[PDB]
Amino acid sequence: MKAPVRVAVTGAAGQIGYSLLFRIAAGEMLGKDQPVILQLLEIPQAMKALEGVVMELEDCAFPLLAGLEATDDPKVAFKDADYALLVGAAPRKAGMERRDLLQVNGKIFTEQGRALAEVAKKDVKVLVVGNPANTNALIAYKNAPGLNPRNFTAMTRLDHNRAKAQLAKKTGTGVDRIRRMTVWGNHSSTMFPDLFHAEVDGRPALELVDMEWYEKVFIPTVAQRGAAIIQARGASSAASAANAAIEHIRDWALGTPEGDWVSMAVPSQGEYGIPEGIVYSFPVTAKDGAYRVVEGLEINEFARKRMEITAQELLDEMEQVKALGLI
Amino acid sequence: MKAPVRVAVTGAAGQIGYSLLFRIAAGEMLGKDQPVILQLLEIPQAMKALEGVVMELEDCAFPLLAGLEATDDPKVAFKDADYALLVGAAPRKAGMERRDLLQVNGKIFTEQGRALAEVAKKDVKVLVVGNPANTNALIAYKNAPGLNPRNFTAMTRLDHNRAKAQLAKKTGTGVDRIRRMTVWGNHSSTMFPDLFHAEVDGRPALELVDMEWYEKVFIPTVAQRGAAIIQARGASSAASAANAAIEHIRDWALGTPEGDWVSMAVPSQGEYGIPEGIVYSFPVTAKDGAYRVVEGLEINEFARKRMEITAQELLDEMEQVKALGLI
């Protein structure tokens, strides 16, 4: 058995946490032979509920759960953390506007970024799920001087998975036969699901589906999927989002399949002309903790335009945050 | 390489289902080498919500999910089923007496038992989670002509795991080092957690903990655990219950560890003098998809008394459903 790794998870008493923690403790994120120590964080008002989650975790009698600790102190939750999943974010209460939301998120991620830089492992892998994910990750790494900025990522894997699901459904093929899907940019509605390099059973996706469907059906449907789940279930897609978070960390820590790639929002270094610094989703391959953007892909006008649009939205968000003195 | 197996799950749009289905699709219940076809059942009023669950499952892009179908017809959900998890049960309505709850469940499980006997695989493995689990399982198998009564079981694995967790905590040992825990009888408050044969790192449990703690702390705590979760979280322990359901089916199908055993409520054949027919939790081992009660265990007066009390409660429940003409 490998030495235990410490996995910090914030917003632990929430919906995503409830669908995330058990699978992590079961070994679904880092391997069935990798013991994990869960270090859970919540706000003071949710600590009672978190104790309940702690009890449920204990009641699963997980052989890989080497340790379990709940706290409301980021410096305790992130202490010696190998992984940190930042799920908690500013909730939209009545009266609050975007700018107000950014203020609160600014405080949350500046504090957590500083806490991570102060007490976590130097190579701690960070995934931001709390929205707005890309910008929150930016706030976090900018306030985490002393930590590799590339270790601060944002989640787009749910959109990535939803895109694969839609393509599989349309072509009548198993989702396991869909490869090289790419979601570029922001986690938002400007998110761009790329089918130009995707393959279905080895065949180019655009040889099986046409541009009309791609533009008028595929894109809108992937973008509205979250809302579709809420309209049907009456609750947010916590389980599939948790699954995506697990895969995001898993494929990064372990590795992506040969000849395939995944989507991850990471600090740009200028790849594909994307402004440097902003956290942007790119097609990436990964191996044992290290990822690399798949550069060199041919980009047509349809993709370029959409990649530019989402890049601009991220730039504007960055400027808004900069104007607030958060970075 | 292995052909897909069909897994039917009722009450699929509920809380337990939400914590259960994703892990089944991920291969956590029947093996990472075993494709599964999920056949989900709900009542008509919950079909829209079930559609939402279906969408979330699709959005996980599970390579092992070979099929996914939602229906409100038991004869469709159970068609050629290899496994059936009966989670849906009568809701606790206001001004609704216990007996009234039994009548509603009588209709539900009489119909499902009949459906299973008509369209499922003859060797379908059934687990009843919906409460009252033991009695609902009794109603189901007694209404499943042509099917093996021993293939109808009820869940006590959550109580079993909770007992292991409490023992681990008290002795300061990893839960992975706790073996031979037993929970006897009904899924209810009369459930009897047995430490007389349990071992901690190979050492008898009662050599590490005293009888006073066992009687006045351990037993009540295991019995009140569900309520503890609710008081802390404000919601039932769906995640850990789902985990227990998964382990119940998993160990039954894949087998129990050498030198260890688990708890399963199964139709009694007179083991330990327990009246025949009632679905009673016994310590059991499993191999090649079949289980066998662990007989030969020494039963002192303390245990005998408690085993008798819970057996009597099950007999009383049996009498009540018989009086309602359900069996």
Ligand SMILES: NC(=O)C1=CN([C@@H]2O[C@H](COP(=O)(O)OP(=O)(O)OC[C@H]3O[C@@H](n4cnc5c(N)ncnc54)[C@H](OP(=O)(O)O)[C@@H]3O)[C@@H](O)[C@H]2O)C=CC1
């Ligand atoms: N530990 C800490 O520092 C903090 C903890 N919290 C805690 O975090 C918890 C938030 O829980 P709850 O309200 O249930 O939220 P959820 O678990 O449902 O959501 C948490 C975050 O994930 C985002 N998200 C992204 N994709 C999805 C998706 N598909 N489904 C659901 N959420 C998604 C949400 O954005 P969106 O709003 O758009 O859904 C939100 O920012 C609370 O328990 C709160 O007390 C809050 C702040 C700081």
Ligand SMILES: NC(=O)C1=CN([C@@H]2O[C@H](COP(=O)(O)OP(=O)(O)OC[C@H]3O[C@@H](n4cnc5c(N)ncnc54)[C@H](OP(=O)(O)O)[C@@H]3O)[C@@H](O)[C@H]2O)C=CC1
């Ligand atoms: N498909 C069908 O034939 C039917 C489907 N249903 C559907 O079943 C679903 C019930 O969902 P919901 O109300 O969310 O219920 P839950 O998923 O929380 O509970 C379902 C069953 O599990 C039992 N249970 C046992 N242990 C636990 C535990 N630790 N935590 C929670 N439940 C536990 C419950 O008993 P307890 O009540 O004591 O918690 C209940 O009978 C509804 O969606 C309903 O529409 C209903 C009837 C028939």
